[PDB]
Amino acid sequence: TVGDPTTDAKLDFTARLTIGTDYRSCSGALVDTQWVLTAASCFADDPNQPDTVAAGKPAQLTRATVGRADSNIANGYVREVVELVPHPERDMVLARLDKAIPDIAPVRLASDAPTAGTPLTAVGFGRTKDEWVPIQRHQGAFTVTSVTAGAVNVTGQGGDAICAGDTGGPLLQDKNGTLHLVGVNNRSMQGGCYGSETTSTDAIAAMSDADFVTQTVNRDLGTGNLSDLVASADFNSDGRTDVAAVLEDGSLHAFYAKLEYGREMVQIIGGDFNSDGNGDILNLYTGTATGILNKSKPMWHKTIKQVTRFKFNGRGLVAQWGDGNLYGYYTKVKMWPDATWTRLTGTADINDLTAVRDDGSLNWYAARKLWPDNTWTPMKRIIGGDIAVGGQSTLLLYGIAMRPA
Amino acid sequence: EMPQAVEDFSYPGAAKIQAETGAILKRGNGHMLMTSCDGSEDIQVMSRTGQKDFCFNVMAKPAYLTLEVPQAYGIWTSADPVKTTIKDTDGTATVINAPANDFTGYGEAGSTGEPTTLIELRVAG
Amino acid sequence: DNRIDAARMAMTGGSGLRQAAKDAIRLSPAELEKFLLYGYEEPLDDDHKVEIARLINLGGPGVREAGKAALQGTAEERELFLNSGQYTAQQDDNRVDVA
């Protein structure tokens, strides 16, 4: 990367990492306060064959410095690398730091690939035209020549080739002040570099992968100690009912059915109550096209024990009252001739309202026995036609482990 | 096919230098560069092999470069102490600490008269 | 005739010249003539710089400064120092060191 030095707080999300005392060195950038994205080849015995870079601890002690645009000052943060999570297909790895850096923001990821002719920029800590190792990081400029199967081919504009030590460095595209990461530098012709010479300025970078990062950074949002506040609805317009649940942070997170994790009170109930095409969550939170709930509003103008979803005439709720009666609401109807209500659950298209008896027996109402055994005694908040939080607070579906471990 | 842009700390252009100056270079921390001797001198090494002499420039401290120069005899320093490792013909190595802003010699021009080889050039820091 | 003079060099000069001479002697006469025409000038950098360096390393302030200056100069200056300049510097150094 040959161009002007830059220390401005636009590219302060970049990082420099070294492996061992002097074994290897390359560049990277933050995707989270705990995670740094770089190339997998940096951790390979043979950088041209980044296939053996297995997940787990680094083979050699690895350190990273973040935000230190100028190496002659202490400005910036230093962290140790504890774990590596390689990409299953291409030359890309996520590094987990021992401690977070809450002061330096990450760079947003691109939603798509840049097309040929698009003006991209790049920043790194690699070699220059006249220096083996720079004091300050530098910014160059590149254009896209073509797009291929999970990678982007670029070339330098007016010289300025990707050189050495640039591996793992980000490829950036911006619009209206917003920066997105479009790819990561892997290989280059290294023209115009100190100590070497070639005409070509061409380089190849791995294409950015937003889903890979999301399922790594948020890999452990759940599976641990969760609340019983769980509800089902389609929040991604997939035709597959998803699951939302509240974590210890007091926030509601959506897990998408294929459970894969998304990006973003006594009882919680979901469903598309207004038939808007976007699943909702006494106040109603309306769904939107972005999967984000809007501000809630009262559904009406405290002696109810349980409330669950129920479809009426194609659209609804059922409430179990402390008097043992069950009523449906659109205008209300009696769901059962007498006060015979038992744990209330949501519905599912078994052929239907599911219920759990105090003796552990499971049944459904058109009641009929739903499960051969009587082991549902400790089960809470059963949601729906597939169908509990479990004794470990880990959601099981009927009991397959829908949640990862 | 393009090479990986990964730094192995191997001195850039070392292959060319061996051919042109006669000096050879291995690994370092990247903060020492070989340059010309024309008013830009920092650390200067003299020998009786290759192109007689050559200069190195310190970019930052600390720094080191494990270069090899046969039949070395003299070193110049400037604005910095220099720690130098040399080796005899029998494989035995020793360390000589050169003061800043002065000139010192090695085996050949030192106390033993031995035709020693320069092994390590290290910048204090 | 050139072999004889070169043979002498091989036994009287410094290590640099001696190695060069004990090579050129057993060589085509045309190349030997070149050696004894300009090739034998190489020791000015190989042997003379070592000899002056030794004087600097083990000398006093007078010798060190005078030698150092010649060392960073040209061949004529180094040759002059190691012929007469060295003695002037050494005597003056002794004079002030004793006083």
Author numbering:
A (entry chain C): 30 to 287, 292 to 297, 307 to 323, 332 to 351, 356 to 369, 371 to 385, 395 to 405, 408 to 417, ...
B (entry chain B): 42 to 166
C (entry chain A): 99 to 197
The authors write:
Here we show that in addition to small-molecule antibiotics, Streptomyces produce and secrete antibacterial protein complexes that feature a large, degenerate repeat-containing polymorphic toxin protein. A cryo-electron microscopy structure of these particles reveals an extended stalk topped by a ringed crown comprising the toxin repeats scaffolding five lectin-tipped spokes, which led us to name them umbrella particles. Streptomyces coelicolor encodes three umbrella particles with distinct toxin and lectin composition. Each contains an amino-terminal twin arginine translocation (TAT) signal, two sets of four ALF repeats (ALF1–ALF8), two extended coiled-coil domains, and variable C-terminal and toxin domains.
We subsequently improved the resolvability of the regions constituting each spoke using local refinement, which produced reconstructions reaching up to 4.0 Å resolution. This process supported model building and provided a blueprint of the interactions underlying particle assembly. In line with our finding that UmbB1 interacts with individual ALF repeats, we were able to confidently model UmbB1 protomers in complex with ALF repeats at the base of each spoke. In spite of substantial variability in their sequences, ALF repeats bound UmbB1 at a stereotyped location, with residues in two of its short helical segments providing many key contacts. At several positions within this region that are highly conserved across each UmbB1-binding ALF repeat, ALF6 harboured dissimilar amino acids. To test the hypothesis that the amino acids in ALF6 at these positions prevent UmbB1 binding, we generated an ALF2 variant bearing the ALF6 residue at position four of its ALF repeat (ALF2(I4Q)). IP experiments demonstrated that this substitution abolished ALF2 binding to UmbB1. Owing to the conserved UmbA trypsin-like domain engagement by the N terminus of UmbB1, these configurations are anticipated to share similar overall structures. Finally, the Umb1 structure highlighted UmbB as a remarkable adaptor protein and keystone component of Umb toxin particles. That is, it interacts with five sequence divergent ALF repeats on one face and four different UmbA proteins on another.
